[PDB]
Symmetry: C5
Subunit: 283 residues, 5 copies
């Protein structure tokens, strides 16, 4: 006897087509369903961010730092954080960062009209913001986790956050923009990874490595940064709204959109636009 | 030749709805044993993980890394509980909320069966956890106070985790339980959708690991930890255990499983379960 | 799909347990011996590892955490070999052949023959890999210098602990062990894929080990070799205090706490499945 | 019950290799250039990420105990995802192409000019993408700046040390290190061509990449990224040391690894059965 | 939804093995030689990588606190990639193919002449590949050079230690350690042969070879590469202590493990089941 082979891989035309169709479907939903999907996605992001911050603050201890700095903490933070996108995608959710590439690709192919593009993007952005800030208020702020203690021994869950936030509010426009470009490149790949492996083992680990690289690299995300900076504002961490909404979030937003539609959408449309035709004529 | 293993959203929603539905033809007596066995599994993994963490809680290591490696290895070790629970047909409260409540919302179950399934499973988990705490953890002398400071790294850890679980306030434990049960319901959704074997392990692993290393409270693990921390004469009072820790984390886990994930999910997908029947 | 769980698992298990009696006697003995020396192999490995990390100056900071961690990380490879080769190990089969007995698929004499022969073969394999490999290698010998002796102190520091545990302690720890191992066999026969096999057995065994639970077969190896290298123990302590309670506890767990309930849980399904055809 | 064999042997990996290489030259001169640029982009991005990791693990005090141990390990843990992105995106890397297309040629499926067409388009696009990402992201971010203080300057100092060590080798050393690198790389390509699984695709490449990373091997495209960005951030190196001392030897070695060490023996083993295959 | 299971363990994993060990003997002399040489190249490559890792971790100040733990740990984490190379590219390795060729002989599918021929070709190719990589790559690359400076020499000293531990053994010690090594690697071959799924191959062989390496057992090919590179970079050993004190015992023990300790019970257990395979084949 001899077993039978299974094709657990299919790339190229297949993946691009899957992504364009994904972007196409997002049209014939309704406003409420997209709203809810986006809010759930924001909730998941915020939850995994809470978890990763607590890990980091554990490893960001009074004395470890005098030797090791912020390495172990950022590492475990990155290690803990990617579970979120698995939740998001396998729940049926909508992420603004993940929708840039797919839906602008469906736009380029002249399937999703413009008003649809705009309302989908706006609703997803709004819902993600809602989810993240909500989870920042109810679950985190009321849990007394990241609150100041005035004890060098015990306050290592505060400094960490503070530090990270104090880091994201001193860069310049160009810096944040490029870092967000890198972020969205990664997460778009991560999305491409989950629309291509078509198996359980492949999804988890590809998305894991993508998001771990994103985190350990120090890049920026409009949905993660919202959570972090809002909650740091809830604790009276040494930042303000100016330093957060007016300085950082707009850079990250524009960088994500760029890396989504231009850096990675135009090339992919150009390369494959001629094989997406032979699939639409047949059917 | 070619077909895709993973299936999210619609298929997974139908799956979870039917899984909640099937908890109501089991004649009131398989549920009890299934629950007690899941509780035994919980307490077993908790014993193992507490030993793991008391190892990295040594006298001198505390000074430098201060309770980091302990929590990390505890989280790394705890997950297998869920795999053994699911691969055995057992029943767990924190994971039954989501499914049975979705089934309820769809008018495939009544309030009677819903309430009694909830109650039976809760009681079975309590029974299993306390039984394992008595038979294995207390008589094994693994968590005995050896007053010497070199060898007492197994007791202190427990004393210094439960002591934390019992000096919260209400809202705090409620929120932390909401987080925990969101993670858990999500691990269950995974295990129902992936249906592969690879993610069947690693998705649940990562989810439970985040749960543990984040600081969230789980109703069953709490029962075990606190009961066995009572057996060994820690500095926790029996009032600080049942009226400060279990009530709020229970409420929070039910909140999370029932309204946070369930309601919006049933709202996004109500339409597409109305078509499968026909 | 590549996983069913719950019902089909019980049936797979009782069938796997039922085929152990059509086997000839010697074949079963050979499988048991192979499994014993597999256990001894992986134990030698895990021990050299935990000894590497039981270093003179590393102890004074972390104590013994790194060593036991590496032990638990390395050991979870024997049972993969036992399963893939078609062997038969005692702790793993306690549950399997007791269920076949419950459903009236196996008699008493044959069930007990299976148990005796498998235990004997496991002992043979363990002691054989001990003598012919671990003791002639000169790997655990003493050197009388704290710089290199970290491979012997470890042993002197572990079998001096399995020994001093009292009766109920060893019984409960063996219970935990055999529960983990029963779940491991359940998984490895119900999760139908390589990733599933490997990563559902690995975590179970790592937890068993890191938890301080005692296994009948592993402790045989450890105590034999600890006797050969002239550690600070004795045959009395090695056989009476540690092995008999471990055996009793492993059997109690595999055969009562775990198989007696689920048997009642999933009885009608096996019954009608055998009435099917 | 069903029987499954998601793996395949060497008789068909070689054929897939041949076919992949054969296909590679049938594309336009435009989409090939774009694929190359995209692969270089991926490479530069993951190199940025891995270098920031390694520098994070390069603190003042952690150096005085473990030197440069953990940094290389985390670097090599982070580096591998580049080839996943590349292969699943449909893009081509120059090193991978060196073995894939040389074989297409030996079998006489391709001709002598499309080989060079493809090689040069790929190398040009890889250089373009690497240098572009080095500029738009790694120099516009102040990540690898010389802040001039031993607390944070580690992020730069690491690069300095790595770069300096990379450019002080003799001609015969870099060619051999490059040989090893490209061997591992073409072998990971072989893997992802034959195994046909997500677990495979991910981890078979993870291990190989971690290996040629932490072994101190030299890769042709990686080096374009880290040497060009080094020039930007004003390390203690020089363009002569960066181009005539590393890239020429590295390229020669990568090529004589992809196309001789592994290419000729394989073409001797499995050529007969390719004749069996065609008909 | 349809069920799929990949691993058909036990009985099947024997049959395949036999056929495997048989194909090696229908091949030609050029093919098998090239295959062995490629496997040797792979072994030498991965061993160089692993030594560099371990010495990077064997830093002057790290040793005074940890000894040699992290070194061997990362060595064992890095080495288990040669095996996948050899498996997927179709090479004839010695310690591995010994069990299969035995099984093919015991089952009277192969002759004694052919057995000796295949074994000699395999071992010769391994020696060639490993020495070629130890000279053309590892020795010219100055990786393991002596600098006579402790802040930097930690890639040399590591080697100078490993070898200086492999050549203060006695005969029975090395024989048993080789027995163990081969009981591990033959087992790894069994895993990939019977798993038939992606993660199976990689992670099974990874754990097996990691345990092997961390165990301290000796494998005939790796020791060739290591002792030869050490002789190149002028450690404190010589050739007598290389082939007379380590390689003969190691090959002996490995062959014993392959064809006697393991396998022979696998013939006795299953000899019939092979006979169960032809008559119903047609």
């Amino acid at each position: 006897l001899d077993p039978v082979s299974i094709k657990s891989v299919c790339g190229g035309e297949e993946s691009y087509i899957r992504c364009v169709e994904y972007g196409k479907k997002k049209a014939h939903y309704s406003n409420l369903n997209l709203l809810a999907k986006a809010i759930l996605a924001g909730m998941f992001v915020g939850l995994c961010a809470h978890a990763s911050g607590i890990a980091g603050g554990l490893f960001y201890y009074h004395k470890l730092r005098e030797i090791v700095g912020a390495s172990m903490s950022v590492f475990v933070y990155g290690f803990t954080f990617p579970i979120a996108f698995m939740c998001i995608i396998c729940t049926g959710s909508d992420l603004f960062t993940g929708n840039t590439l797919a839906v602008t690709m469906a736009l380029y192919e002249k399937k999703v009209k413009l008003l649809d593009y705009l309302r989908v993007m706006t609703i997803s952005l709004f819902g993600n913001y809602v989810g993240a800030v909500s989870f920042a208020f109810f679950v985190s702020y009321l849990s007394g986790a990241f609150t100041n203690v005035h004890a060098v021994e015990k306050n290592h869950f505060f400094q960490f956050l503070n530090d990270i936030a104090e880091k994201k509010v001193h860069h310049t426009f160009v810096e944040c923009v490029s870092l967000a470009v890198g972020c969205n490149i990664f997460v778009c790949l991560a999305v491409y990874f989950v629309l291509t492996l078509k198996d359980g083992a492949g999804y988890v680990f590809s998305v894991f490595f993508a998001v771990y690289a994103f985190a350990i690299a120090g890049y920026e995300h409009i949905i993660a940064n919202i959570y972090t900076l809002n909650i740091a504002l809830m604790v009276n961490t040494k930042i303000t709204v100016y330093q957060a909404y007016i300085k950082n979030l707009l850079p990250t937003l524009l960088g994500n959109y760029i890396a989504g539609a231009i850096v990675l959408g135009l090339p992919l449309y150009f390369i494959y636009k001629e094989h997406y035709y032979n699939f639409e004529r047949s059917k």
